[PDB]
Structure 1
């Protein structure tokens, strides 16, 4: 039965994937079901690419649809259905597994006597919305994302796996649509909750790393470019050519150099077509990032227009508008005097506190310790007589 299948799999398999197969059978015989889960997983980590994946799933699922925890079951199937090209086939298999699980859980809840099985379902649901995006039915996929988000969050406790799957689905939907703003929000989340699994391929990491950097050029509130670079997703992937000139842009934003910026952008505006259509945003973005830099360093409460004119190299007409933009972002607060040509900044938005600044804080706090101290001691002495 299951024996004839094991023969075909071993032979065309690599001779280094050969003993994985032998182990499967042995663990079944002995009824170690824990070990058995384990060995299955070892196959799908790295042999999901190969043509044998699909086969192993119909047979394995039918045999071990009761032994191993439920969440184990759906995870294996998922991997198989990425390399499954046909997206009507993917959708078929999904609905069969969805029914399967609902029935199973009814008995099984009572055998365990306690286990949340509503987890498996949510994962199934998540994947179906994913089918739809690939076939470009954004409308169906949308209301299914909605409902997912509500039930999940009503939960007071959630595993990483479930919320990770749901964010993946979202991420894909936002870049397809060509909405830079939304994707940036998702991508961050996805990174935070990211499974300790290394099943996540380098290719997947590299493609996301690419979309995040393009989002942040175009962005609506990102000035956090340095912080972003410090995370594994970009941090390691720097010698590659795609991640060179790219990262060069991020770093040009930090120092606000106008000159390096101009050279990069001229070449690359043709190359990446996202940047062509979003030209206004990108062009504003260098100018803004310079403005935030000039403002933060001069902590005095007023700046002439002349400071801005020179740093951003723009005419004065454009200056007061640029001053309107910062204020609309909420990055800055204050008022504009046109009669004297001033910007009175009255609020600065906190940024990354460098080491030097830790010392600065401390120096002022000592001074203000002393003031309280001097003042209490003298005033006790004054009118000492009455303190009932």
Structure 2
């Protein structure tokens, strides 16, 4: 029956992974298909790297599709084809299930009275785009992606699973092209909307954290360095050696200490050809971070170039460029008097506000609160006669 197909997988696996299959079949006989869903989940966590996972699932699609939960089936299918090294094959399975729902909900919806098949359809479309990103036809993938994005926002209330898979495709595209900036925002949505019943492994996740740090260092409009260090993903992984030094580069930028920065760069630029072909981006970043930090934290908003020159270890020729760049990118806006020798900034970009800054923000507010109160007594005092 299924016992005979199942037997072959049982032989090839470990003895200690043998009992697990017997329980799957136990539930099938009894006709408890909620309990089968739960049983199936278990194998997949610790052995989706097996081809036994693939096999298992193929037999399951054939004998269960209205029996086990619909959603569990399609989530499996995302997992399955990551394990298939064949792409031609991937396309075949996605289209069989997609076709199968179209006829099915005509019968299915009226008879039960409910259960939507369009949730499956999106999960399916996500995997098709994913397949074209792994075959590296980048024009094709992109264009399915724009179409899919219109489609998601039409659906009123989005399940976290669907939007999680969307955001995976979006990440994969942007680091292949090596647009560091486009990647950064999309991965903040990815880390957020993360599902509780795992499907993005610990192994995968550690390479994603890395990818993010590289992006922030070599970019040119990322200054959310701390947020990554405050996010659970990095809070927990700071304890492994190849995850010491990388973060130390990111923290060197945050406190703007040029002594720490120059030395780490010497080492790691040699190691990593990515920091080396994007060296110029990397050198600029500390000096920009420094500019925006000094105005914001100060209650003054005019600074002599002397102060800026000493901080960023630049000549006066390069303070003038740095200030100009901030203005182009839109990270500061202002105007420059090279005749008074000031840079009068007039706007600061809001950014992340950390423990230290709240204290500074707070004090400014106490001063104006007290100022109105003092001032108000005189205005009570004067014009006493009339308050009608």
**TM-score scaled to structure 2, two decimals?**
0.92
Q: In the TM superposition, what is the alpha-carbon distance from 1:197 to its structure 2 partner?
A: 2.3
Q: In the TM superposition, what is the alpha-carbon distance from 1:78 to its structure 2 partner?
A: 2.2
Give the conservation status (yes or no) of the 8 Å contact 2:249–2:264: yes
* Alignment CA distance shift 1:380-1:207 (3 Å): closer
- Distance between the aligned counterparts of 1:228 and 1:337, measured in 2? 37
Q: In the TM superposition, what is the alpha-carbon distance from 1:129 to its structure 2 partner?
A: 1.0
- Secondary structure of 2:336 counterpart: strand
Between stretches 341-350 and 203-212, larger displacement belongs to 341-350
Q: In the TM superposition, what is the alpha-carbon distance from 1:12 to its structure 2 partner?
A: 2.5
Partner of 1:77: 77
- Distance between the aligned counterparts of 2:379 and 2:266, measured in 1? 69
- Distance between the aligned counterparts of 2:369 and 2:255, measured in 1? 37
Q: Which has the higher contact order (CA 8 A, sep 6+)?
A: 2
Partner of 1:135: 135
Between stretches 319-328 and 372-381, larger displacement belongs to 372-381
Count of paired positions:
388
Q: In the TM superposition, what is the alpha-carbon distance from 1:47 to its structure 2 partner?
A: 2.2
Q: In the TM superposition, what is the alpha-carbon distance from 1:358 to its structure 2 partner?
A: 4.7
**TM-score scaled to structure 1, two decimals?**
0.92
- Distance between the aligned counterparts of 2:355 and 2:245, measured in 1? 29
Q: In the TM superposition, what is the alpha-carbon distance from 1:147 to its structure 2 partner?
A: 1.0
* Alignment CA distance shift 1:57-1:357 (3 Å): closer
* Alignment CA distance shift 1:298-1:109 (3 Å): same
Q: In the TM superposition, what is the alpha-carbon distance from 1:253 to its structure 2 partner?
A: 0.7
Between stretches 322-331 and 61-70, larger displacement belongs to 322-331
- Distance between the aligned counterparts of 2:3 and 2:263, measured in 1? 65
| 1:119-198 matches, cutoff 5 A | 119-198=119-198
Partner of 2:371: 371
C-alpha offsets along residues 214-233 of structure 1, whole Å, 9 cap, x if unaligned?
11012232111111112122
Give the conservation status (yes or no) of the 8 Å contact 2:152–2:158: yes
- Distance between the aligned counterparts of 1:333 and 1:78, measured in 2? 46
- Secondary structure of 1:48 counterpart: coil
Q: In the TM superposition, what is the alpha-carbon distance from 1:31 to its structure 2 partner?
A: 1.6
- Distance between the aligned counterparts of 1:83 and 1:379, measured in 2? 76
Q: Over the residues paired in the alignment, what is the CA RMSD in angstroms?
A: 2.2
C-alpha offsets along residues 242-288 of structure 1, whole Å, 9 cap, x if unaligned?
21211110111112122221222233223322222222211101221
* Alignment CA distance shift 1:360-1:280 (3 Å): closer
- Secondary structure of 2:6 counterpart: helix
- Distance between the aligned counterparts of 1:382 and 1:184, measured in 2? 58
Q: In the TM superposition, what is the alpha-carbon distance from 1:320 to its structure 2 partner?
A: 0.6
Q: In the TM superposition, what is the alpha-carbon distance from 1:318 to its structure 2 partner?
A: 1.1
Q: In the TM superposition, what is the alpha-carbon distance from 1:199 to its structure 2 partner?
A: 2.9
Give the conservation status (yes or no) of the 8 Å contact 2:34–2:69: no
* Alignment CA distance shift 1:98-1:9 (3 Å): same
* Alignment CA distance shift 1:284-1:117 (3 Å): same
Q: In the TM superposition, what is the alpha-carbon distance from 1:306 to its structure 2 partner?
A: 1.0
- Distance between the aligned counterparts of 2:329 and 2:152, measured in 1? 32
- Distance between the aligned counterparts of 1:36 and 1:284, measured in 2? 57
Give the conservation status (yes or no) of the 8 Å contact 2:295–2:301: no
- Distance between the aligned counterparts of 1:64 and 1:53, measured in 2? 16
Which ranges of structure 2 fall in alignment gaps of 5 or more residues? Answer: none
Give the conservation status (yes or no) of the 8 Å contact 2:105–2:116: no
* Alignment CA distance shift 1:44-1:353 (3 Å): closer
- Secondary structure of 2:38 counterpart: helix
Between stretches 208-217 and 332-341, larger displacement belongs to 332-341
Which ranges of structure 1 fall in alignment gaps of 5 or more residues? Answer: none
- Distance between the aligned counterparts of 1:379 and 1:313, measured in 2? 51
Q: In the TM superposition, what is the alpha-carbon distance from 1:118 to its structure 2 partner?
A: 0.7
- Distance between the aligned counterparts of 1:374 and 1:323, measured in 2? 40
Between stretches 343-352 and 51-60, larger displacement belongs to 343-352
Partner of 1:9: 9
- Distance between the aligned counterparts of 2:198 and 2:355, measured in 1? 35
